[PDB]
């Protein structure tokens, strides 16, 4: 027919139950209370499996000692004895680990593409009729990617631990919320007050759920119109630069002292009537813009609103993009849900669904939308899926209808102002000591805060376990210090640290086990580029080799508090300067090492292979 999108139900809008078409129809996960209850239980189980509340409580004392041993300046120390800082560290540490792992997988994908750029260029140029999903399969096969599936089922199987979204209610379980002092400036009373968070922080955690996008999701929008390998890589980096900036904003909302809003769906109080209408309000915690979607009958309308600069009277800010008239004053039952996709991903499907509003049934429109928001499940309709990915690229590209850099900058300024206002208000009410406990000024942004990233190692070379940490990219400029903590069963041990650059690596041998040891100090300019031994670099790789290891931690610290920001890179900025990461794969064997091998040595000195012994 004329329509490219064909509804599973015909023009009669009736599908017989028990038939194949009805079996493959999408389900309303948000609207169905059985479906919503099941999704929440599985999500909580996944979080509790990887992150154990009983384990995090036990490791509190060990982490507190390490943070003090960093010898930070006054006003920049992180005190984990305070309950508020410990809760913020728990959320931040898991947030940064997930972002770190996604960045690591992106670098491997970039290296794989560059190794087979001739075959990749042929696929992109010759084949344009196939969909985005089919193009991703061919690319992920031509390159020897570890994960070769873009299907949601294959992604979940190969997702692995460490990238599981954080579940706020699990983190906030069992923490004291109400403590009174009643005008008692005493050491015992102040110690008691430091043990409890306030109600505002409890409400923030109950409405928090992080979103982390795998590189196998990003590849489909990246290759939808890409014609060359450079365009594909440039699109991949542009999307992840936007994602990382939004992820930073998400953590900053917990630091400032206000309650974050919760996404909800409004549906009519009376079920099974003629009149059918639904209103979705999405408040992405990891973003600066929101979405309001209204479906009355077969008509779909949307409005993109700013999450900043809003008075207390109205939750919605100014409208930055309009797609119709949406009434948010509709009366009905309110069902709260947690979005699992970014604002751009939600917006991309809304534009695609509006185009095919009359070509799909209402149940298909609702089921496809709710499955994406609540499960990150892409629509099974291939034609609908392809249009969504085309809109996702447009929302990210330079021709985007939304100026993302302007809105992200405004969100940062608005959040900083709110922190100052809330700190001054509580200072007058209670005092400086109480205000500092509840609103710590040391945390600020996610990549500005001093944070630790526990490392997991599955590779053992001659009895030495390799722990890999990727240094950079940096969204801030200043001076950065890196430290490593090594816990080993043996009483005396020798461990090695290696930093890989574009031309050569630096080998370090250390012996101190439990106290943190500084490994690398760097200076980064306003372009997010550091000068590592005469060569400009955008990121570095740090590998720790430890024998009979139990735990390895890496601490990131900025010299100054509230480090100034670096403008987010776009597609034009990424294609301008190209850095080679093919050297991040090579390893060394600490067992076969000599005194002459330690230090900074360029590749020319080594042979082919044998990156341990410096004899050519």
């Amino acid at each position: 027919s004329q329509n490219s999108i064909i509804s599973l139900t015909g023009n009669d809008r009736t599908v017989a139950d028990g038939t194949f078409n009805s079996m493959i129809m999408p389900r309303a996960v948000i609207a169905n209370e059985r479906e919503h209850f099941m999704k929440t239980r599985i999500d909580k189980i996944e979080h509790d499996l990887n992150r154990s509340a009983k384990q995090e409580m036990m490791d509190r004392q060990s982490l507190a000692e390490d943070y003090n041993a960093l010898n930070l300046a006054v006003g920049q120390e992180i005190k984990l004895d305070i309950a508020t800082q410990h809760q913020l560290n728990r959320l931040g540490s898991a947030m940064y680990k997930a972002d770190h792992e996604r960045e690591t997988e992106l670098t491997d994908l970039i290296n794989r593409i560059r190794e087979n750029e001739v075959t990749v260029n042929g696929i992109l140029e010759n084949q344009k009729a196939i969909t985005a999903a089919e193009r991703a399969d061919l690319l992920l096969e031509v390159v020897a990617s570890t994960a070769k599936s873009v299907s949601a089922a294959g992604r979940a199987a190969a997702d692995g631990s460490g990238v599981v979204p954080v579940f706020g209610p699990s983190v906030a379980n069992g923490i004291k919320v109400g403590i009174d002092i009643a005008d008692s400036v005493a050491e015992a009373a102040i110690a008691v007050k430091e043990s409890g968070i306030i109600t505002q922080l409890n409400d923030v955690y109950h409405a928090f759920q992080s979103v982390h996008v795998a590189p196998n999701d990003v590849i489909k929008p990246a290759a939808v119109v890409a014609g060359t390998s450079t365009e594909l890589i440039g699109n991949l980096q542009a999307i992840y630069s936007r994602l990382r900036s939004h992820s930073d904003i998400g953590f900053k909302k917990a630091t400032v002292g206000d309650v974050i809003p919760n996404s909800y769906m409004i549906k009519p109080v009376n079920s099974t009537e003629y009149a059918s209408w639904q209103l979705y309000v999405i408040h992405p915690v990891q973003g600066s813009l929101g979405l309001v979607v209204q479906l009355m009958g077969d008509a779909l309308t949307y409005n993109v609103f700013a999450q900043y600069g809003n008075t207390s009277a109205s939750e919605f800010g100014k409208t930055v993009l309009t797609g119709g008239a949406t009434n948010t004053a509709l009366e009905g039952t309110k069902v709260k849900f947690q979005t699992k996709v970014t604002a751009q991903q939600a917006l991309a499907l809304t534009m695609a669904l509006k185009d095919a509003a009359s070509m799909l049934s209402q149940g298909e429109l609702i089921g496809y939308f709710e499955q994406y928001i609540n499960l990150a499940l892409e629509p099974d309709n291939l034609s609908l899926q392809d249009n969504m990915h085309k809109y996702h690229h447009l929302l990210t590209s330079q021709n985007s209808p939304i100026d993302w850099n302007y809105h992200d900058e405004e969100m940062h300024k608005w959040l900083d102002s709110r922190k100052t206002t809330n700190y001054d208000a509580m200072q007058k009410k209670d005092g400086t000591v109480i205000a500092d406990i509840h609103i710590p000024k040391v945390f600020n942004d996610l990549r500005n805060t001093t944070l630790h990233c526990k490392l997991e190692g599955k590779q053992t070379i001659a009895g030495y376990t390799v722990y890999e940490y990727l240094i950079g990219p940096w969204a801030h400029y200043g001076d950065i210090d890196y430290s490593v903590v090594v816990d080993t069963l043996n009483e005396e041990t020798k461990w090695y640290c290696e930093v890989i650059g574009i031309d050569g690596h630096l080998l370090i041998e250390k012996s101190v086990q439990h106290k943190p040891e500084k490994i690398l100090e760097l200076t980064v300019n306003d372009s997010g580029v550091t000068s590592f031994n005469g060569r400009n670099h955008d990121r570095l790789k740090l590998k720790v080799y430890v024998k009979d290891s139990l735990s390895v931690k890496v601490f990131r610290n900025w010299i100054g508090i509230n480090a100034p920001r670096v403008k987010t890179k776009m597609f034009n900025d990424h294609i301008g300067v190209k850095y080679d990461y093919s050297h991040f794969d090579k390893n060394i064997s600490p067992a076969h090492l000599t005194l002459t091998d330690l230090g900074w040595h360029t590749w020319d000195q080594y042979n082919a292979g044998n990156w341990t012994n410096i004899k050519p």
Binding site: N11, D12, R13, T14, A16, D17, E273, Y274, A275
Partner: protein, 249 residues
């Protein structure tokens, strides 16, 4: 009005054979079916009179675009005289007769998933009178015979005791059963009692009395066909015949 005047099974099925589906469908927007409303009845009360609108009223209502709405529009036309608002059905379906939709597979409409209990409840079978329930049961039997669902029709009658007593007796494939049937299915007709130009309280009763009073005017109008005085002027194709058989019966 013409559909409500038919008083025998033979006349009802004969009318449905010559009546296309577009007569069942209405092109007026109407209102949503189930609503508690206040109407004005000044002949009886000064205050507004509460009532609930329904699909078997004589006034067009808005209908669902699915097949369920189409069948529910056909039955409402038979029992109430007006259908519902289901636009953009298509030329191919609308040109077919009502009997063809209910009885023939060649129309292209699939109706085997229909539930008689849900359709009856949506049509407010409790509010229907004896003639209205008999007419709806005729529609159910024709649909059951089309889909090979004769057993399901009988079980649905067993669950509903009042429906079993008044269920018309005819085999939807044999014309001999239709001729023998003597059930009175007329909703409007010449009244033996005193019929006055007075209003009724409920929407259904008031709308029904409008058709009853309109039929009296139609009976004496020039449009009415008087078989006793003008039988020779009728065309032979549509002239009344003792050996009148529906096609395929």
């Amino acid at each position: 009005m013409d559909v409500l005047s038919k008083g025998s099974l033979k006349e009802l099925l004969a009318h449905l054979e010559k009546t296309p589906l577009e007569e069942a469908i209405s092109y007026r927007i109407g209102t949503v079916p189930y609503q508690n409303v206040l109407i004005s009845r000044n002949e009886y009360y000064n205050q507004l009179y509460p009532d609930t609108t329904s699909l078997i009223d004589g006034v067009s209502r808005e209908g669902q675009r699915n097949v369920n709405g189409l069948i529910m529009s056909i039955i409402s036309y038979v029992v109430s005289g007006s259908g519902h608002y289901i636009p953009n059905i298509g030329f191919m379906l609308l040109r077919r007769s009502i009997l063809d939709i209910l009885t023939k597979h060649d129309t292209g409409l699939v109706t085997n998933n229909l539930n008689y209990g849900i359709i009856a409840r949506n049509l407010t079978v409790s509010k229907m009178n004896c003639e209205q329930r008999k007419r709806m049961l005729i529609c159910f039997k024709l649909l059951a015979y089309k889909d090979g669902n004769q057993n399901d029709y009988e079980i649905y009658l067993n669950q509903n005791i009042p429906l079993k007593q008044i269920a018309p007796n005819f085999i939807p494939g044999d014309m001999r059963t239709v001729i023998h049937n003597q059930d009175q299915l007329a909703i409007v007709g010449i009244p033996a009692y005193r019929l006055t130009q007075s209003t009724e309280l409920s929407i259904r009763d008031d709308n029904a009395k409008s058709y009853k009073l309109g039929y009296v005017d139609w009976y004496n109008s020039n449009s009415f066909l008087r078989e006793r005085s003008e039988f020779n002027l009728i065309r032979l194709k549509d002239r009344d015949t003792k050996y009148g058989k529906l096609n395929g019966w």
